[PDB]
């Protein structure tokens, strides 16, 4: 759904605390203003992506205190009131499994601060607690109200009568729910059990979010390592040039570093603009899945999990969304 | 329904008149393309470490052998300013194509059809949509049914009548607290529970939360009124 | 008397829906609404 | 039953049609309504 909001200052990166290098950088005109603008456009878009996926409900729906969902046990996907962040049980499995990659990026690059290379990590507009509270409202709406809170106000319906409305949607007559309701609830409870067990046991499954963290980490590794490149100048350290030479012999060396560094930013910003377009495509798909699999029942084949779609439950993950799709 | 549609179109006129914010998604695309061009033209003013950014002044003030060294700088910096602009434009064009392919998909599914896709063709249950053109874009007026004034009701998954369990064919069972009805799913219009409104399956035991109520048989008064005409014929035939 | 103010944002209005195992809400009336959507 | 089904045309047109009975739930009701009637007639032959 998003990636880490990283803003690099092009002046700090190319010419860190040298007024001499800054005076030379001005000869290239707008490229640093344009590069800081380009990265700021990517950073603003991460909030847009996260808001379009999660903020689809305009009321914060609470789940009732009386958990009589006709035998269906949503305890693993509803909030635990006793935790500090009010996440579900399954959301904490997702959170730990990706934060074991985030914490590397945060220490290498939670009051985040600018590094001397000019790298800065900005906070998202929505905290993980605010994404959990939107996700709670979507799930509490779904189990108390069915699809009706997508279209109108939330209209309550008993959960086994909602599942009958859904069974009719897949072309199965509603008595096939009620004549089997303990079996349908036991298979649902057993399948939410297998989700929980799998997310605790698995090495590979959250690779689709690990990949987004790892690409941004590696693009920042590459961008920072290019500060060590001489570009044919006497040194890759900017003060070690201004200490050794004079006001004219230095400039030929500083301009080498300005040229190569600026190209290293122009490269990084191009990879990041193309990346942001791929994460926005993923966020527009996640917003479409939230609208069509959570706020409704989809007759689109295989769009909401491999089966006939009944309903879906959103769960937050770091930089992403998980849908638990429920299928006949 | 006509007066609500006519009123809602009246609010579209008022909204599109009253605020400059309304077409912001189009104005943002004009503004970014204008910004990218204005930046590309400002890079012609940049020195790139030549003694002047004006190419004709470099050519006037220097002989061929020295001028090539100055103009090499200006070519390198200007060529990078084109490759920057054209990269931004190729990436921008991909965001505008994704938007155009979405708009073509909404034209096909919301105008040329009716969509079951929730929140795709506007918020609510989609009735139909009307396209209107705009500068470099398209506006869709999505018409939706939104359910507006609810009452709470007591409800049951099924009815027992003759030990057989009954379910709605379409719609849901509801009660005002004294009588049971069947009604359509998205609009309160109650009807007497009958063997036409309901279908039967199994005994009364297996459906959790089932309720006892009469199910009316619409053929029964036909055979009862036809039985009273028969009883008049038999009683009359006692008399000759 | 106006001022710049900073605050934790509200996500939306609160609503505890009146769910029970035997109760349903059904709309007696509906609004036809027309919503503009704008695409580049 | 005649409720679970609907009619169109005659047997010769459908490739691979099969002969089976289609039941009518109005019928055994109307027969119970004949056995209720005939016993009446027979009683009224008696006096
Ligand atoms: C639940 O819905 C029922 C159906 O609309 C409704 O029953 C109906 O109530 C009206 C009175 O409000 C009755 O009208 C008759 O009232 C007396 C009957 O003796 C006559 O003097 C009147 O002239 C008039 O005919 C309907 O006959 C009655 N229908 C049935 C089938 O009984 C209930 O009142 C509703 N209950 C609640 C709590 O809303
Ligand atoms: C729905 O309607 C049903 C039919 O009127 C009704 O079933 C009847 O329930 C009573 C009490 O359970 C039974 O009474 C018998 O109970 C035991 C034996 O099981 C004996 O101690 C009694 O003397 C008596 O024989 C009826 O036999 C039973 N009728 C049938 C056909 O099974 C339901 O209770 C009603 N439920 C609701 C919620 O309205
Ligand atoms: C439908 O009914 C619910 C709950 O039943 C009612 O609760 C009392 C208010 C009283 O009138 C009882 O005799 C009813 O059976 C309503 O839920 C209440 O809503 C009000 C706001 O209108 C709210 O302050 C209360 O907290 C709610 N009750 C509880 C127990 O929390 C609900 O509003 C009714 N729906 C409609 C559309 O009117
Ligand atoms: C919903 O499922 C959870 C398990 O995922 C149930 O919690 C367990 O309840 C038993 C009996 O009290 C305990 O022995 C377990 O240790 C509990 N496990 C956990 C993780 O809490 C919960 O009781 C179920 N709810 C309903 C309504 O059945
Ligand atoms: C359903 O909603 C409509 C409005 O969309 C209601 O119509 C209004 O009714 C009042 C009288 O109750 C009139 O003063 C208005 O002029 C009507 N407006 C329109 C556009 O017709 C209607 O009464 C509602 N019906 C029910 C049963 O609630
Ligand atoms: C049909 C049914 O089972 N209804 C039950 C009701 O009997 C019980 O009092 C209530 C308490 O939560 O839960 C519901
Ligand atoms: C009885 O039957 C005779 C015809 O046989 C008819 O003229 C008469 O009106 C009938 N009366 C009633 C009350 O049916
Ligand atoms: C099915 O195939 C067999 C030949 O293997 C053929 O005799 C039979 O008539 C076919 N049935 C229909 C309904 O066409
Ligand atoms: C015929 O019906 C009468 C009542 O109408 C009854 O008294 C009589 O016993 C019946 N007899 C037989 C043999 O059905």
Numbering used by the authors:
A (entry chain A): 729 to 837, 849 to 1067
B (entry chain C): 923 to 1162
C (entry chain C): 689 to 728
D (entry chain A): 1116 to 1162
Task: Show me the paper's own sentences about this structure.
SARS-CoV-2 is an enveloped positive-stranded RNA virus that depends on fusion of viral and target cell membranes to enter a host cell. This first key step of infection is catalyzed by the virus-encoded trimeric spike (S) protein, which is also a major surface antigen and thus an important target for development of diagnostics, vaccines, and therapeutics. The RBD can adopt two distinct conformations: “up” for a receptor-accessible state and “down” for a receptor-inaccessible state. We have previously identified two structural elements, the FPPR (fusion peptide proximal region) and the 630 loop, which appear to modulate the S protein stability as well as the RBD conformation and thus the receptor accessibility. In this study, we have characterized the full-length S proteins from the B.1.1.7 and B.1.351 variants and determined their structures by cryo–electron microscopy (cryo-EM), providing a structural basis for understanding the molecular mechanisms of the enhanced infectivity of B.1.1.7 and the immune evasion of B.1.351.
3D classification identified five distinct classes for the B.1.1.7 S trimer—representing one closed prefusion conformation, three one-RBD-up conformations, and one two-RBD-up conformation—and two different classes for the B.1.351 trimer, representing a closed conformation and a one-RBD-up conformation. For the B.1.1.7 S trimer, most particles used for refinement were in the RBD-up conformation. In the one-RBD-up conformation, one 630 loop on the opposite side of the up RBD becomes fully structured, inserting between neighboring NTD and CTDs in the same configuration found in the G614 trimer. The second 630 loop is partially ordered, whereas the third one remains disordered. A similar pattern is found for three FPPRs, although the structured FPPR adopts a conformation distinct from the one seen in our previous structures of the full-length S proteins. Overall, the arrangement of these structural elements appears to stabilize the cleaved S trimer and to prevent the premature S1 dissociation in the one-RBD-up conformation. Moreover, in the one-RBD-up conformation of the B.1.1.7 S, in which the FPPR is at least partially structured, Lys854, which in the G614 trimer probably forms a hydrogen bond with the main chain carbonyl group of Gly614, flips back in B.1.1.7 to form a salt bridge with the mutant Asp570. In the one-RBD-up conformation, the NTD and CTDs on the opposite side of the up RBD move closer together, narrowing the gap between them and stabilizing the structured 630 loop. Once one RBD flips up, the fully or partially ordered 630 loops of the neighboring protomers stabilize the CTD2, which folds together with the N-terminal segment of S2, and thus prevent the premature S1 dissociation. The B.1.1.7 virus is the most sensitive to the trimeric ACE2 and the RBD-up–targeting C63C7, suggesting that the B.1.1.7 trimer may prefer the RBD-up conformation.
